[PDB]
Amino acid sequence: LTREELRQIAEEDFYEKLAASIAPEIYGHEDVKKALLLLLVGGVDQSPRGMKIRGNINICLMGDPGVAKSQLLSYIDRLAPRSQYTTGRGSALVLADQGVCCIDEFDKMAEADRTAIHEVMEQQTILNARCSILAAANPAYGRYNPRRSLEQNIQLPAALLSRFDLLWLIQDRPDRDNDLRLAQHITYVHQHSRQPPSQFEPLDMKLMRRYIAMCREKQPMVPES
Amino acid sequence: IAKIKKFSKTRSKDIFDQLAKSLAPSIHGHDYVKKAILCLLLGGVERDLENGSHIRGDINILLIGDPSVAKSQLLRYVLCTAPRAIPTTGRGSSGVGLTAAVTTDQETGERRLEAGAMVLADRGVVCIDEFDKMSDMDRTAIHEVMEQGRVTIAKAGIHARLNARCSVLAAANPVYGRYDQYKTPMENIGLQDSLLSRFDLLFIMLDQMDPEQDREISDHVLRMHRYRAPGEQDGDAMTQIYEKHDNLLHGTKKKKEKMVSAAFMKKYIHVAKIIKPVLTQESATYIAEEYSRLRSQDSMSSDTARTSPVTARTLETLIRLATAHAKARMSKTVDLQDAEEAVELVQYAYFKK
């Protein structure tokens, strides 16, 4: 980048501004935004003492339909430099090497492909499959039941869920004030064709892509303290 | 042009009532279904944003009810009237028929794309009878079209994206054959939550054998049966805005009202679809408050049950129905009654006792 643009990224509370800059059109869900930002950044890859460790961040987001998961997937597909957006039936892993593989309707896929997904998750190989997997799932009955166990509500094996380093549950809990706030924000987005005015205007997509590219270039070393 | 303007100026609020009333003289009753069909003919507004995100402007309506309630007749009439109408039954066309496929040409060795049923029917109407008989795989295939109006195809050596912005009519029968009054609508419909949510409007039709209703239906059917086209000898084998009154088609009582001609109706529908309405600030707050009331109605549902879950797509459905109603009458802005009609339609469709 031009260092002035990096300074334009590095004001106070820059972490919050970067987190909110990802999909600002969807109100709230700042934790999921931070998780997606860290997935964009990613960890470090090391091969100590004969074994290879992964630095890729794989996140599984499951929630009731209508919580704007598909729009988040489309936005992260747009923003990521190497991104592959695919559906369950419609399928790619190799094509998204050193990138992000955005897949939705994970719960609506046969277990035969799921079996091959385990090797990709565990070793990032198939050929190399060094990619960040972002999977989307839905409850079996269309609504998440807290009475039922998590595995039954996801109808996926426990090992597959464990291989996902982050799990985020979004439930469409009915709250009057939250519903009114969401409705008014949606109406402003429709009428003005723009996001509601927040504290700080989000950064451009190109600037964020370049900043993520530069931050990926560094390999921090973990202190022993 | 002059006749259309005169009819719009004279009949200010009566356009939406008359077009729904004169939609199908051969079919008796079902005013809400006729209003929904009129809204589909008018259509919504497709909006493109600076970021390039696409928002659907089509409406999906599913009709479920007992046999012999004049549902196939409505589908055939819509097929006849719609410019781009393609009929696809449940098991008549599979996912391969509905969704475009890739065929490897032997002459040149390259791969070409052949359009599917929905790809050809761009900005049109697709009618699906016996939707209950359709498999779940075809429903998932249709889900992408119903959500974003696009089909993504990727086979080794070629990849492309095709537009599938279309509206769908679906007619299905209950799982038990006849709708059960005692059992909940969820058991009778027997469909997943995602499919119902993607649908914008749900209508349930009941064959209530009331003496007056039966007498009226029989009289209407009998009058239509005894009718013969003028200019044809009896026993032989085989544009004004208001239609000419007929003693059999209309009746002595209906002499006080006249039906709109088909050609004039088609021209007015096309002109209205050309018109681009703009939403107002006054209606936005009212729609938001009514949406909040609908979401909070779970504690006020009383003994009435809901046919479909209420999600964020309902607000978009409300806006789209308001846009269609604004298209019904030639105007530029959205008024209060414009949203009130859509709210009444939602109240009728969503809640059943």
Name the token pair of B246: 């007929």
**Contact residues on chain B for A86, CB-CB shorter than 8 A:** 154
A55 alpha-carbon distance from chain centroid: 15
Residue B163 · residue B124 · CB < 8 Å: no
| Rounded Cα–Cα distance for residues B198 and B146 (Å) | 7
| Rounded Cα–Cα distance for residues B43 and B59 (Å) | 8
Identity of the residue in A176, A183, A191 whose CB atom sits nearest the CB atom of B315: A183
| Rounded Cα–Cα distance for residues B24 and B37 (Å) | 11
A89 touches chain B (CB under 8 A): yes
Long-range CB pairs of B251-258, under 8 A, 24+ apart, other chains included: B251/B223, B257/B21
Q: Are strands A99-104 and A131-137 parallel, antiparallel or unpaired?
A: parallel
Identity of the residue in A70, A180, A186 whose CB atom sits nearest the CB atom of B315: A186
- Answer whether A179 sits within 8 Å of B292, measured CB to CB: yes
Deposited resolution, Å:
4.1
Q: Look at residues B70, B176, B92 and name the one whose alpha carbon lies nearest to residue B138.
A: B92
| Rounded Cα–Cα distance for residues B16 and B58 (Å) | 19
Instruction: Return the sign of the alpha-carbon dihedral for residues A61, A62, A64, A70.
Output: positive
- Sorted by sequence, the CB contacts under 8 Å of residue B198 that are 6+ apart come out as B60, B143, B146, B147, B313
| Rounded Cα–Cα distance for residues A18 and A33 (Å) | 9
Cα distance from A93 to chain B (closest Cα, Å)? Answer: 13
**Contact residues on chain A for B312, CB-CB shorter than 8 A:** 66, 68, 182, 186
Residue B348 · residue B332 · CB < 8 Å: no
| Rounded Cα–Cα distance for residues B55 and A17 (Å) | 27
Residue A57 · residue A101 · CB < 8 Å: no
| Rounded Cα–Cα distance for residues B244 and B259 (Å) | 8
Instruction: Return the sign of the alpha-carbon dihedral for residues B69, B21, B84, B323.
Output: negative
| Burial class for B194, CB neighbours closer than 10 Å (0-12, 13-18, 19+) | buried
| Rounded Cα–Cα distance for residues A76 and A208 (Å) | 12
Backbone φ and ψ of B301, nearest 5°: -70, -20
- Answer whether A142 sits within 8 Å of B309, measured CB to CB: yes
Local structure of A167: helix, strand or coil: strand
Chain A, 128-167: which have a CB under 8 Å from a chain B CB?
138, 141-143
Q: Look at residues A138, A162, A131, A222 and name the one whose alpha carbon lies nearest to residue B311.
A: A138
| Rounded Cα–Cα distance for residues A24 and A129 (Å) | 30
Residue B63 · residue B40 · CB < 8 Å: no
| Rounded Cα–Cα distance for residues A46 and A42 (Å) | 13
B288 touches chain A (CB under 8 A): yes
B344 alpha-carbon distance from chain centroid: 16
Length of chain A: 225
Q: How many CB atoms lie within 10 A of CB A18?
A: 20
B152 touches chain A (CB under 8 A): yes
Q: What is the DSSP letter of A55?
A: -
| Rounded Cα–Cα distance for residues B79 and B171 (Å) | 13
CA distances from B93 to B135, B142, B201 (A): 11, 12, 24
- Sorted by sequence, the CB contacts under 8 Å of residue B108 that are 6+ apart come out as none
Residue A205 · residue A78 · CB < 8 Å: yes
- Answer whether B279 sits within 8 Å of A190, measured CB to CB: yes
3-state secondary structure chain B: CHHHHHHHHHCCCHHHHHHHHCCCCCCCCCHHHHHHHHHHHHCCCCEECCCCCEECCCCEEEEEECCCCCCHHHHHHHHHHCCCEEECCCCCCCHHHHCCEEEECCCCCCEEEECCHHHHCCCCEEEEECHHHCCHHHHHHHHHHHHHCEEEEEECCEEEEEECCCEEEEEECCCCCCCCCCCCHHHHHCCCHHHHHHCCEEEEECCCCCHHHHHHHHHHHHHHHHCCCCCCCCCCCCCCCECCCCCCCCCCHHHHCCCECHHHHHHHHHHHHHCCCECCHHHHHHHHHHHHHHHHHHHHCCCCEECCCCCHHHHHHHHHHHHHHHHHCCCCECCHHHHHHHHHHHHHHHEEC
B135 touches chain A (CB under 8 A): no
| Rounded Cα–Cα distance for residues B68 and B127 (Å) | 18
Residue B131 · residue B46 · CB < 8 Å: no
- Answer whether B197 sits within 8 Å of A186, measured CB to CB: no
| Rounded Cα–Cα distance for residues B217 and B238 (Å) | 27
Q: Tell me the β-bridge partners of B205.
A: B65
Task: Count the alpha carbons within 13 Å of A138 in the hemisphere toward its beta carbon.
Answer: 20
Alpha-carbon dihedral B182, B188, B193, B195, rounded to 10 degrees: -150
Structural gaps in chain B: residues followed by a C–N separation over 2.5 Å:
238
The method recorded for this entry reads: cryo-EM
> Residue B73 annotated as binding?
yes
Q: Which amino acid is at B199?
A: F
**Contact residues on chain A for B320, CB-CB shorter than 8 A:** none
- Answer whether A89 sits within 8 Å of B141, measured CB to CB: yes
| Rounded Cα–Cα distance for residues B276 and A117 (Å) | 48
Longest dimension (CA), chain A: 59
Identity of the residue in A176, A193, A194 whose CB atom sits nearest the CB atom of B292: A176
Q: Tell me the β-bridge partners of B231.
A: none
- Answer whether A174 sits within 8 Å of B296, measured CB to CB: yes
**Contact residues on chain B for A143, CB-CB shorter than 8 A:** 193, 309
**Contact residues on chain A for B53, CB-CB shorter than 8 A:** 25, 71, 74
- Answer whether A143 sits within 8 Å of B137, measured CB to CB: no
Any idea which residue has 């109006």 for tokens? B149
Residue B197 · residue B309 · CB < 8 Å: yes
CA distances from B203 to A36, B169, B188, B259 (A): 41, 12, 13, 25
Cα distance from A64 to chain B (closest Cα, Å)? Answer: 9
| Burial class for B286, CB neighbours closer than 10 Å (0-12, 13-18, 19+) | middle
| Burial class for B50, CB neighbours closer than 10 Å (0-12, 13-18, 19+) | exposed
Residue B143 · residue B160 · CB < 8 Å: no
Angle between helices A205-216 and A14-21 (to 10 degrees): 120
Q: Tell me the β-bridge partners of A137.
A: A62
Identity of the residue in A92, A108, A143 whose CB atom sits nearest the CB atom of B140: A108
B156 touches chain A (CB under 8 A): no
**Contact residues on chain A for B136, CB-CB shorter than 8 A:** none
B311 touches chain A (CB under 8 A): yes
Length of chain B: 353
A190 touches chain B (CB under 8 A): yes
Identity of the residue in A142, A174, A183 whose CB atom sits nearest the CB atom of B193: A142
Cα distance from A110 to chain B (closest Cα, Å)? Answer: 12
Task: Count the alpha carbons within 13 Å of B200 in the hemisphere toward its beta carbon.
Answer: 28
Q: Are strands B101-104 and B111-114 parallel, antiparallel or unpaired?
A: antiparallel
Element (H, E) at A169: strand A166-170
Q: How many CB atoms lie within 10 A of CB A149?
A: 10
End-to-end CA distance of chain A: 34
| Rounded Cα–Cα distance for residues B260 and A75 (Å) | 48
> Residue A66 annotated as binding?
yes
Name the token pair of B186: 């969820």
Identity of the residue in A71, A174, A191 whose CB atom sits nearest the CB atom of B284: A191
**Contact residues on chain B for A68, CB-CB shorter than 8 A:** 312
Instruction: Give, in degrees to the nearest 5, the angle at Cα B70 between B64 and B76.
Output: 95
Name the token pair of B220: 């209407």
Identity of the residue in B154, B296, B313 whose CB atom sits nearest the CB atom of A176: B296
Q: Look at residues A39, A47, A44 and name the one whose alpha carbon lies nearest to residue A221.
A: A44
Cite the beta strand spans of A9-158 per DSSP E: 59-63, 83-87, 99-104, 131-137
Q: Are strands B125-129 and B111-114 parallel, antiparallel or unpaired?
A: unpaired
Long-range CB pairs of B101-105, under 8 A, 24+ apart, other chains included: B101/B153, B102/B153, B102/B155, B102/B158
| Rounded Cα–Cα distance for residues A168 and A137 (Å) | 11
- Sorted by sequence, the CB contacts under 8 Å of residue B188 that are 6+ apart come out as B64, B174, B175, B176, B179, B180
Name the token pair of A36: 């997606």
Q: Which fold has domain A3-225?
A: Rossmann fold (3.40.50)
| Burial class for B240, CB neighbours closer than 10 Å (0-12, 13-18, 19+) | exposed
Q: Which residue stretches of A101-199 are H helix? A: 111-123, 150-154, 158-163, 176-192
| Rounded Cα–Cα distance for residues B14 and B216 (Å) | 25
Backbone φ and ψ of A174, nearest 5°: -80, 110
Q: Are strands B125-129 and B85-87 parallel, antiparallel or unpaired?
A: parallel
Identity of the residue in A90, A183, A190 whose CB atom sits nearest the CB atom of B292: A183
| Rounded Cα–Cα distance for residues A41 and B62 (Å) | 45
Local structure of A158: helix, strand or coil: helix
Instruction: Give, in degrees to the nearest 5, the angle at Cα A132 between B49 and A155.
Output: 90
Cα distance from B125 to chain A (closest Cα, Å)? Answer: 25
- Sorted by sequence, the CB contacts under 8 Å of residue A46 that are 6+ apart come out as A52, A53, A55
- Sorted by sequence, the CB contacts under 8 Å of residue B294 that are 6+ apart come out as B310, B314, B346, B350
B248 touches chain A (CB under 8 A): no
Instruction: Return the sign of the alpha-carbon dihedral for residues B184, B190, B195, B200.
Output: negative
Residue B280 · residue B333 · CB < 8 Å: yes
**Contact residues on chain A for B147, CB-CB shorter than 8 A:** 70
B332 alpha-carbon distance from chain centroid: 23
Alpha-carbon dihedral B239, B241, B247, B250, rounded to 10 degrees: 130
| Rounded Cα–Cα distance for residues B43 and B26 (Å) | 24
Q: What is the DSSP letter of A53?
A: B
* A/B interface, count of CB pairs below 8 Å: 68
